[PDB]
Amino acid sequence: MDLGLKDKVALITGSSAGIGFTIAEKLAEEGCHLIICGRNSQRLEQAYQSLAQAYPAQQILRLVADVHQAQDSEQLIQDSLNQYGKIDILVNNSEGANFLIENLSDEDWLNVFQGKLIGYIRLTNLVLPIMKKQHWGRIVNIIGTSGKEPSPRLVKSGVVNAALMNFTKSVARQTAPYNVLINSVNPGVIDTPRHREYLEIYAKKEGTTPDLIRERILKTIPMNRIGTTEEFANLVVFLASECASYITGITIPLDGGLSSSA
Amino acid sequence: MDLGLKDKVALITGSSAGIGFTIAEKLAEEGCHLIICGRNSQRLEQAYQSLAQAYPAQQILRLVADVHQAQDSEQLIQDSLNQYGKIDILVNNSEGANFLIENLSDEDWLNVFQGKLIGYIRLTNLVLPIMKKQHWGRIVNIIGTSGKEPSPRLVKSGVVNAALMNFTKSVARQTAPYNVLINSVNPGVIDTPRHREYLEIYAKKEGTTPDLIRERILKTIPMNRIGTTEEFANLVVFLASECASYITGITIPLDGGLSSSA
Amino acid sequence: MDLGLKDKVALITGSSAGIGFTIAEKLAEEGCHLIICGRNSQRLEQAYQSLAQAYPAQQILRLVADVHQAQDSEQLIQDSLNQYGKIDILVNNSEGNLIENLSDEDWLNVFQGKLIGYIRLTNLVLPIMKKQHWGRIVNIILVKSGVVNAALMNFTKSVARQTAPYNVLINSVNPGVIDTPRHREYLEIYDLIRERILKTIPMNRIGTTEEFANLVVFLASECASYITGITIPLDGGLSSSA
Amino acid sequence: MDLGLKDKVALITGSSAGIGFTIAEKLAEEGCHLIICGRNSQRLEQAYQSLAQAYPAQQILRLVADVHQAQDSEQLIQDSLNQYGKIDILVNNSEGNLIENLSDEDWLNVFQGKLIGYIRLTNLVLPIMKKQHWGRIVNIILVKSGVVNAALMNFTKSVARQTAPYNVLINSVNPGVIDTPRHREYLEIYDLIRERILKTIPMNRIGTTEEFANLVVFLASECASYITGITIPLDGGLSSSA
Ligand SMILES: NC(=O)C1=CN([C@@H]2O[C@H](COP(=O)(O)OP(=O)(O)OC[C@H]3O[C@@H](n4cnc5c(N)ncnc54)[C@H](OP(=O)(O)O)[C@@H]3O)[C@@H](O)[C@H]2O)C=CC1
Ligand SMILES: NC(=O)C1=CN([C@@H]2O[C@H](COP(=O)(O)OP(=O)(O)OC[C@H]3O[C@@H](n4cnc5c(N)ncnc54)[C@H](OP(=O)(O)O)[C@@H]3O)[C@@H](O)[C@H]2O)C=CC1
Ligand SMILES: NC(=O)C1=CN([C@@H]2O[C@H](COP(=O)(O)OP(=O)(O)OC[C@H]3O[C@@H](n4cnc5c(N)ncnc54)[C@H](OP(=O)(O)O)[C@@H]3O)[C@@H](O)[C@H]2O)C=CC1
Ligand SMILES: NC(=O)C1=CN([C@@H]2O[C@H](COP(=O)(O)OP(=O)(O)OC[C@H]3O[C@@H](n4cnc5c(N)ncnc54)[C@H](OP(=O)(O)O)[C@@H]3O)[C@@H](O)[C@H]2O)C=CC1
After folding, report:
1. CB of A208 within 8 Å of any CB in chain D?
2. Closest approach of chain B CAs to the CA of A163, in angstroms?
3. Residue B33: strand, helix, or coil
4. Which of A3, A252, A256 minimises the CB distance to D232?
């Protein structure tokens, strides 16, 4: 399927590892030029070298930026514009809340809202005039199924994820006549560094092994397997495509059937 | 129907006018003692005199407090405890976001999150240990249908409302074994001072009359009428009751059929 | 709370036992006159005697009827109308690799049960309620079951939208685990099993028919005058626990 | 993007025109062999010739069948299996005061259409797909219509849960306003009417069959290997505009 992405410019946030890195690879494969970013310079340079060596025909700009920070996010967009003169695609991908409700303080909630929640809203606001001006844009938000059905070990995430799903609908409605399409994808369980970190921290809290936490997860997923970042990236790349030109304002679970199992 | 509310202590926030005032009246009618509050002292004293004269057999504590503010909210709960020694019911009711997305700044969003969103979360956190300790509690959050299906003239509200609906489910799950039940009610269009203020500000933005804005609203509601605060309060009072002892974690539209019309 | 139900006439289907029986009790307590019905004439007679003794001032009509049959349902409505001259409230309450071995005939049979049963009775009472400008309809809602229930939830919304201008309000309630005869029977054909179910309910307790009935009676009241087209889970928090 | 569809066998129902026809084209373009079907033999012959000429290297079986009839649907599946030895993909695509005047017979007739039609064809292909450990089923989903569509959305979830361990994935797509023959016909029996519909669509444009088909082909691909049980609106933003 020709996805019409040749020479499009994609900004993928949080793209030195996990879901974000594989999305960057797959967009480069379809002919996009990239902007990649992350907080840790060493990890970012490793990712940059991997992508540059794999897709030497594509332009790739790597920038150290914390996209929870206003200054870094504003400067990321300006650097991107200085390099490419346009941004066609934005993938919003950044870290959510950390791993009883009465015990969470105001500060705890405020740090949550000042992370991924305003992070995605801010970068959306920053790219909208760019994409509107050219009557072509795609924004894909990487959210999480907890926004739809919350999980006990994920309370703050669920609140943030619900908010972002609602935001997605409101902005989609406003930007639709400009051919600026905005969607979200809710990962189920996808095998990334963060997922494997979740396996360690909860095996300890629960006094068990990563393997047993994983067997318990696998029993909940109809497919009886944890998704790969490639499987996840395929949908994101489709939504970022010319082929997805009538799809906007929706949130799609990518979860091995987890939502059918609720 | 005996609702089992005699001598229960109810805190109704934002209760000097509109939905909140009528909820206070109806809870007093069923035999509760009250705490009422608001920001404007003059408006609050008028409400206090109205309720005290109508329900002289009930105790009523009135306090000036902005329940978007941490200090005022903490002190409201301590004052309530000093007066009554317990809080049985909390009705979360406070002002939402004010009347294009790219144009909203970080500060604008942050003020939103520091209003009703953290306001309801904070007061929930403050009352939970009180209600848990006595294995009896009810929290009813007054949200808004925009959390379910957002409206163009209500973007920031929708984001906040979605978040709060998700929060409601997560906290309900955790507090259920303590007989501390938490639900939300999503008003449609209910005839309050704020609603009538909405009619003025949008008749001006649109160059028309309040009457015509109202006729346009009425065509969207299946019942062909705007709800009264009494109709709205009936459900809240039911949810705050002993009769609602198996209902928790849900959000109920109270909207004249507006949700069936989406 | 004054529910405004004195002298209202309520038809509660499946009311000889369980959830339907306790809904009938609570409606009588609020001042309704009743029609109660069921297939098991003996269970229905027991129910009727219990209600008549507890509520000697209320009128109670009992009718043997299978509300999955057209002719029975038509005559149930005609018989109720003849007795009372009005029907104010209807509570619809009737009984509801693996998937690819369900035949055409299997699926047709489930559609001819509770699905068309609730639709048909709704249709039969709507003219009467529209004439009155007063009505309340409350619908008590594996693979087959889920399909029927999704269908009925959507039917509830569609009808509510159309009938709202006549003050004929229709809503649905979705029970979690409620201590009914089916439930106590459903345990034994499968505490032990109970202890596993309790672990899945956040409240850690099975609901009572009384707890369930309270909500149905609210929705059937004058106090619910601005509530229509909605489906409410009454489930001890199951729906907050995916 | 390589969809992994070379030599996969796809049955697309209602494929002589409109959405089904363009889905068949796009599948052939990705390397599938096809079964196309329809009731109107003349329209079906036109479709078949168009496809055979555009995709001379692909196999295309055309069968006249009414996929709301049991016997036609059984023979459609048997005939496809005989020709190809496998069925990898099924796309279910067939035709779908007011409420209280819908009779029992009216409702029974709608349930015997698209509702049981999609369920029956699903059931008929599931053994074949489970044998293969490879399948994709995509379901193209007033009062009657909404009831059927809610039922089918829920059916999609239930079947997806059961068949996921066999790599038989099932999803649904809900079109908004798509420029099909029914649509251009549906205008005239009621631009003018078009200009009012366009005002309701945030994108301010009616979708093309090509735009719709692209998503169906994605969902039917190897690339959608972790996606099952979901329903996706393809609607130019209608669903973000209540
Ligand atoms: N994996 C899963 O199963 C699930 C994932 N998700 C969501 O998916 C998204 C991706 O998660 P996942 O791939 O597992 O995470 P990983 O931690 O495996 O990868 C995250 C990547 O993003 C970078 N990153 C994180 N936060 C920021 C930031 N503020 N600024 C810049 N770079 C950042 C990280 O680099 P560095 O640390 O150097 O910045 C790293 O490159 C997240 O939004 C997460 O909440 C949700 C549900 C389930
Ligand atoms: N009316 C409707 O149709 C709708 C209402 N809602 C929601 O319902 C709730 C009630 O709205 P409504 O009755 O129309 O509002 P009104 O403005 O008519 O009444 C609000 C009352 O609450 C008080 N109040 C507001 N904010 C605060 C605060 N931070 N601290 C203390 N008191 C406060 C006001 O007094 P003072 O100003 O003196 O503090 C007043 O007594 C709100 O959460 C609103 O978002 C949502 C959708 C539709
Ligand atoms: N209990 C639960 O937790 C759940 C219940 N539900 C739904 O709740 C409703 C009531 O369930 P519950 O009380 O547990 O069931 P029970 O079997 O305990 O009680 C059913 C009552 O309805 C009557 N009844 C059943 N079918 C018919 C019929 N076709 N015509 C006339 N009367 C009938 C029975 O009498 P007779 O046998 O004499 O006709 C009996 O009086 C049903 O709609 C069910 O599908 C759904 C999910 C969970
Ligand atoms: N177009 C839209 O915007 C919307 C569409 N839908 C759904 O989308 C799907 C396709 O719609 P669309 O292309 O607009 O419809 P069209 O009528 O334009 O095309 C329908 C195609 O399906 C065939 N068909 C219909 N019924 C049967 C049957 N029982 N057996 C065999 N073939 C059949 C027709 O051929 P023949 O007549 O020869 O059998 C024709 O090839 C349907 O499932 C519809 O309900 C839902 C909502 C909106």
Report:
1. no
2. 5
3. strand
4. A252
Å from B251 to nearest chain C CA?
A: 8
The CA distances from residue C45 to C24, C60, C87, C184, C210, in Å, are 14, 12, 22, 22, 21
Distance of CA B67 to the CA centre of its chain: 12
φ and ψ of A167, to 5 deg: -50, -45
For ligand 3, whether the C-beta of C68 sits within 6 Å is: yes
- Judge contact between C172 and C231, C-beta under 8 A: yes
C180, C208, C227: which to substitute to probe chain B, counting the most B Cβ within 10 Å? C227
Q: Ligand 1 within 6 A of A142 CB?
A: yes
- Residue D107: which domain range? 1-242
Give the CA distances from residue C216 to residues A176, B255, C114, C140, C224, in Å, rounded to whole numbers and listed in that order. 43, 18, 19, 9, 10
CB B38 less than 6 A from any atom of ligand 2: yes
Residue at B133: amino acid letter: K
Burial class (CB in 10 A: 0-12, 13-18, 19+), B6: exposed
The residue written with tokens 């059931």 in the block is D123
Nearest-by-CA chain A residue for D171 = A257
Residue B185: strand pairing partners: B142, B252
Nearest to B261 by CA among D199, C164, C137, C139: C164
- Split into its structural domains, chain B has a count of 1
Q: Which two tokens stand for residue D57?
A: 């290297």
- State the CATH number of the domain containing residue B224: 3.40.50.720
What's the angle, vertex CA C203, arms to CA C200 and CA C206, rounded to 5? 75
Burial of C146 per CB tally in 10 Å (0-12, 13-18, 19+): middle
With CB atoms and an 8 Å threshold, state whether B125 touches A102: yes
C43 lines ligand 3 (CB under 6 A): yes
- Please say whether the beta carbons of D15 and D36 come within 8 A: yes
What resolution, expressed in A, was reported for this entry?
Answer: 1.8
Looking from the CA of residue B40, the nearest atom of ligand 2 is: 38
Inter-chain Cβ pairs, chain B and chain C, closer than 8 A: 126
Q: Which residue has the tokens 């939970």?
A: B128
Residue B94 near ligand 2, beta carbon < 6 Å: yes
**CA atoms in the 13 A half-sphere facing the CB of D64:** 8
CB B9 within 8 A of CB B88: yes
Cβ B229 vs Cβ B262: under 8 Å: no
**Gap from CA of A18 to ligand 1 centroid (Å):** 7
